[PDB]
Design a protein around this nucleic acid. Structure first.
Lengths: 497, 70, 511, 7
DNA sequence: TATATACTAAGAACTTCTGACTGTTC
DNA sequence: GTTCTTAGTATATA
């Protein structure tokens, strides 16, 4: 969808006396559950997609304010970019004392009408000016029949909800919890896009993740040309990036204001001010000095116009894993520049896959960049698990190292092992099996940095101190393999360390 | 500090600062006058306060710093 | 390591004439020595260069005599290379009219080495003589000369106009003498130490490769908690960046110290200037607002680690990881710390087991404390000289990205017709850069890209030359040998006209 | 491998 | 002589007046 | 034109 558009999620909780103090047992509370869900998802969205929009608005309350001054509707925080000033507002309600505050500030929960509630949320989406990529409404209620008493209200409810379904807005409820009354065919089968007393769909909204994302975007579009005449349009995209911590901003100590760094360069002999034209680049070789233009120090790189230079093809066994150089990239046609080039792209991909052969190219990502040698190794698509995209179809960009990279190894001799040790190592390596999944692990540094960020933001008692799968679970290795370390010691270990 | 945070701890961990409980300034404000700080009013301090302990230059501790009261 | 360089050129008469179709040995070896001095100029290696332009019309050498050590002009003694020496060589040299022996110059350079290579610390010595073998030489001291070369640790090489695979009988018997001498130095392999002048151009044309020594990092390869093994990390690949890099200097004065890149921090209000390095505290963006984090709290709340922590998290199938996902900056090589053989054999057991069972290891990695940890593939490698294991960063989950990328097999709007398909077959078979050779399935990899110098550094050194050898002059274009180097070998381009031609009639190519 | 004069 | 962080430096994906409409009027 | 996104260019520690 349109990239500049942004995701927008509005939160809407049943504020009636129904679930404010349901608390059948003393281990949970639906309001203490819905607010917990909202806080968790909203803090996750802080780090994840800080560019997006969230809003929380309660219905059925006794105090009133909204855009249209209606009855029993409270817009707690409007639609805006997420921030701590609202983390605190939500946190103010977490607690039995907090629920006391909520009830004596907005109300026990009066009469309501989800027709008017959807009215309000629709107005909220309409209000804000930034374009919206996706628009989702989350209800939080368990009164599976909003009203079996006034049918006209319910008819008006289907009407307005169907309208919202056709104004571009989706709607969603998770059935939180109710003694009985845990069904969706009662008035909601026609609303949302078998059933039980609790929603799995709300459990994952507690998964409490700190990833971040960037949407479907080119790194750079370059025109792959087979020769000097045939040219096709390729979008160089990125599929692994090594996220770094967000770059810090310098604050004046005490105002906490931005400080607007103003680095400059000027003379030492005089109190003048050197201008960018007024400086020269230099090196020192052979006990003699060198001068070039600041312009020339970048002209020393002009090698080829931007694009891709296919020369020939290679067998996929000759392209070796042993010589990785840079994060790989992905190749996919972009129909916009050269119309119909997608056909030729597909032809090359299919036929190369058929003959199990690589494609070699010269890659000049932008101007003023020396070219490297890159392999267009085709990739087949796989969808088998649930018919959802896993490996996008197209070409890799396996960068091929230049000679100046080999880093000649300090040769040492080899000593073969005896087949007895390798035979027992067979069992050793078998025992420590574990299936590896691409998203198995997290950066302890990035995760902990984000965690400390919330910790300092929200004035907590003590940071989360997340423990992460990066550290090995030592007892597991000592146990599930046994004491075979001593076996390999008595096999191949003299007394010295 | 009306209440702690880990930054309190940080500046607690960074003793280069002297970290003060809120009521005493209210006290000073209710005195209309700066009441000189007595560690009943603090949580923690750089040692220079502690050399002050006598109200002057001779200790480091407490079980000591009390004025006729109940 | 250290090395001593003493080049020896002749300035006699015979090299002043040659076949009109090929440049004379004088100018040929002259370009050769010029660009060789270029090599050891750009490379910052501590090699010290001396020059002996024997066969001189005069005699300017420390060992001057009536007939002993005659007709030699030592250009300059064994010190560092520098530009003015190169310029003088390019200019001061003159065509000669005499003929002189080269054993004379060989012994003269021998004496120079014995007189200087001990006065300053050295490790290995090299003597190189360029000539055309048109000299009158006696075999008197050859035994003693080779003896001293063995004792003084000097390697002798000769470079001659003819090719091993039309010269005078003088030159022919000189060539036989040269073979005798080289074999009298090293052995039968002395044949390879014979060099022509065209092949010298071919083997020398490129600028000096930027050799780069790695670091012996030893680490404790940890598996479980009771099978620690000392492991030595070395390297296979690193994106190499220049070592000397651009100093900013003021025009018309050309002093570095006359410029200060001082940074000043101001405030947005009335352009108030903040005090440079104590009033600023670093913040971070958490949604709308900025949290006053700091540096002290950074070092206090930062994640910590034990240290090296190269500990194996587990083992997995080869296909369980893939080429695409390799997320490294650099690719390590994982070898045993030397002198502990039992460790080496244990590691060999590890590697071979992983190989035959195509299993791959996943190890937590960290270069050291205060550095971000790291998880990735530990791939094992086999070479007849030695087994190998390599480590590469593999992504953390936040680093992985996901995209839809609407598929292609829905090509009801693109429709790769069979004519196009068999066309592309003709292409990918015809432009096949690699084709099987020697019945060993070593395909036509006359584009390895693994032996090919990085053109960036080539252009950088060429620029530094062309604007060093000259005062202010406009820059030159890319030297054609660089382009021929970068472009594919010609035969592939030749084979490609017809298939690309049949392409151009089978697809749309809108603007 | 090439060495010395070539390296 | 490493690797880590900062920086700054640049490139790209995000605006650019004109047309049509509805009233309003007669 | 604005903002962004890289990179890469720099510096500093044992």
């Amino acid at each position: 969808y349109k990239y500049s558009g942004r995701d927008s999620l509005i939160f809407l909780v049943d504020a009636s006396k129904a679930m404010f103090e349901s608390q059948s047992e003393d281990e949970l509370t639906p309001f203490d559950m819905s607010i917990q869900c909202i806080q968790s998802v909203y803090i996750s969205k802080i780090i994840s997609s800080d560019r997006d929009l969230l809003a929380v608005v309660f219905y059925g309350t006794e105090k009133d304010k909204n855009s249209v001054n209606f009855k029993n509707i409270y817009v707690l925080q409007e639609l805006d970019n997420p921030g701590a000033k609202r983390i605190l507002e939500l946190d103010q309600f977490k607690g039995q004392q907090g629920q006391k505050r909520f009830q004596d500030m907005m109300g026990h929960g009066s009469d309501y009408s989800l027709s008017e509630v959807l009215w309000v949320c629709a107005n909220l989406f309409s209000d804000v000016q930034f374009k919206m990529s996706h628009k989702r409404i989350m209800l939080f209620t368990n009164e599976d029949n909003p009203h079996g008493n006034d049918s006209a209200k319910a008819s008006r409810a289907r009407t307005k909800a169907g309208d919202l379904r056709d104004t571009g807005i989706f709607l969603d409820l998770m059935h939180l919890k109710k003694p009985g009354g845990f069904d969706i065919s009662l008035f909601y089968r026609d609303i949302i896009s078998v059933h039980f007393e609790e929603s799995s769909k709300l459990e994952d909204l507690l998964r409490k993740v700190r990833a971040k994302e960037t949407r479907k975007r080119a790194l750079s579009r370059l025109k792959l040309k087979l020769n000097k005449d045939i040219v096709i349009s390729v979008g160089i995209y990125n599929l692994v990036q090594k996220a770094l911590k967000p770059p810090p901003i310098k604050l004046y100590r005490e105002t906490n204001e931005p400080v607007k760094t103003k680095t400059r360069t000027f003379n030492t002999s005089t109190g003048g001010l050197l201008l960018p034209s007024d400086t020269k680049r230099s090196q020192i070789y052979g006990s003699r000095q060198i001068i070039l233009e600041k312009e020339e120090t970048e002209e020393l790189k002009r090698f080829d116009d931007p694009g891709l230079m296919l020369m020939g093809f290679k067998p996929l066994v000759l392209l070796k894993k042993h010589h990785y150089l840079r994060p790989s990239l992905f190749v996919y046609p972009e129909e916009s520049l050269v119309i119909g080039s997608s056909t030729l792209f597909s032809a090359l991909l299919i036929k190369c896959l058929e003959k199990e052969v690589a494609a070699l190219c010269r890659y000049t990502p932008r101007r003023n960049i020396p070219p490297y040698f890159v392999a267009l190794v085709p990739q087949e698509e796989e969808l088998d698990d649930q018919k959802i995209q896993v490996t996008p179809p197209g070409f890799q960009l396996v960068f091929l190292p230049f000679a100046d990279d080999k880093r000649k190894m300090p040769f040492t001799e080899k000593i073969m092992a005896t087949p007895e040790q390798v035979g027992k190592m067979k069992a050793i390596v078998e025992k420590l099996r574990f299936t590896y999944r691409s998203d198995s692990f997290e950066n302890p540094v990035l995760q902990q940095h984000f965690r400390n960020l919330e910790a300092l933001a929200l004035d907590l008692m003590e940071p989360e101190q997340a423990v992460d799968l990066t550290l090995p679970k030592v007892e597991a290795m000592n146990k599930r393999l046994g004491s075979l370390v001593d076996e390999f010691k008595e096999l191949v270990y003299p007394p010295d360390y | 500090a009306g209440s702690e945070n880990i930054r309190v701890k940080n500046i607690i961990l960074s003793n280069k600062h002297d970290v003060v409980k809120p009521a005493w300034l209210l006290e000073c404000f209710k005195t209309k006058s700066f009441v000189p700080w007595q560690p009943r009013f603090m949580i923690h301090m750089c040692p220079s306060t502690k050399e002050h302990f006598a109200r002057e230059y001779d200790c480091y501790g407490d079980s000591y710093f009390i004025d006729t009261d109940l | 390591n250290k090395a001593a360089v003493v080049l020896c050129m002749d300035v006699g008469f015979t090299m002043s004439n040659s076949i009109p179709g090929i440049e004379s040995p004088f100018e040929q070896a002259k370009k050769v020595i010029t660009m060789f001095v270029q090599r050891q100029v750009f490379a910052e290696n501590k090699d010290e260069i001396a020059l002996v332009l024997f066969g001189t019309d005069g005699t300017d050498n420390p060992l001057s005599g009536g007939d002993q050590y005659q007709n030699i002009t030592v250009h300059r003694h064994l010190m560092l290379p520098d530009f003015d020496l190169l310029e003088d060589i390019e200019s001061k040299i003159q065509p000669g009219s005499q003929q002189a022996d080269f054993l004379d110059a060989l012994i003269v350079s021998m004496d120079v080495i014995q007189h200087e290579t001990i006065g300053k610390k050295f490790e290995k010595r090299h003597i190189e003589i360029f000539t055309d073998l048109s000299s009158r030489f006696s075999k008197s001291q050859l035994d003693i000369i080779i003896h001293s070369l063995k004792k003084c640790d000097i390697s002798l090489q000769f470079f001659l106009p003819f090719s091993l695979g039309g010269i005078t009988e003088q030159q022919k018997e000189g060539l036989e003498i040269v073979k005798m001498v080289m074999i009298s130095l090293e052995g039968e392999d002395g044949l390879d130490e014979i060099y022509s002048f065209s092949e010298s151009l071919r083997k020398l044309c490129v600028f000096k490769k930027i050799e780069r020594h790695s670091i012996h990092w030893p680490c404790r390869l940890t598996i479980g908690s009771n099978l620690s093994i000392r492991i030595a990390a070395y390297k296979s690949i690193l994106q190499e960046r220049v070592k000397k890099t651009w100093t900013v200097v003021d025009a018309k004065t050309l002093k570095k110290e006359d410029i200060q890149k001082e940074t000043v921090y101001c405030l947005n209000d009335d352009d108030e200037t903040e005090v440079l390095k104590e009033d600023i505290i670093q913040g971070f963006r958490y949604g709308s607002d900025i949290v006053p984090f700091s540096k002290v709290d950074e070092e206090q709340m930062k994640y910590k680690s034990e240290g090296k922590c190269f500990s194996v998290l587990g083992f997995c199938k080869s296909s369980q990881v893939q080429r695409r996902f390799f997320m490294g900056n650099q690719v390590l090589k994982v070898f045993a710390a030397r002198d502990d053989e039992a460790a080496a054999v244990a590691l060999s057991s590890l590697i071979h087991a992983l190989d035959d069972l195509d299993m791959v290891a996943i190890v937590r990695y960290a270069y050291d404390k205060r550095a971000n940890p790291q998880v990735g593939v530990a791939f094992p490698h086999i070479k007849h000289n030695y087994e190998c294991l390599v480590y590469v960063q593999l992504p953390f989950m936040e680093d992985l990205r996901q995209y839809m990328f609407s598929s292609l097999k829905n090509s009801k709007k693109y429709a790769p017709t069979e004519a196009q398909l068999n066309a592309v077959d003709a292409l990918i078979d015809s432009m096949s850069l690699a084709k099987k050779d020697e019945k060993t399935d070593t395909l036509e990899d006359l584009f390895p890209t693994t032996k090919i110098p990085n053109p960036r550094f080539q252009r950088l050194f060429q620029c530094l030359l062309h604007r060093a050898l000259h005062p202010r002059e406009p820059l030159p274009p890319i030297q054609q040998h660089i382009w021929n180097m970068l472009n594919p070998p010609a035969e592939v381009t030749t084979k490609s006209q017809i298939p690309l031609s049949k392409i151009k009639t089978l697809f749309p190519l809108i603007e | 491998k090439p060495r010395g004069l070539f390296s």
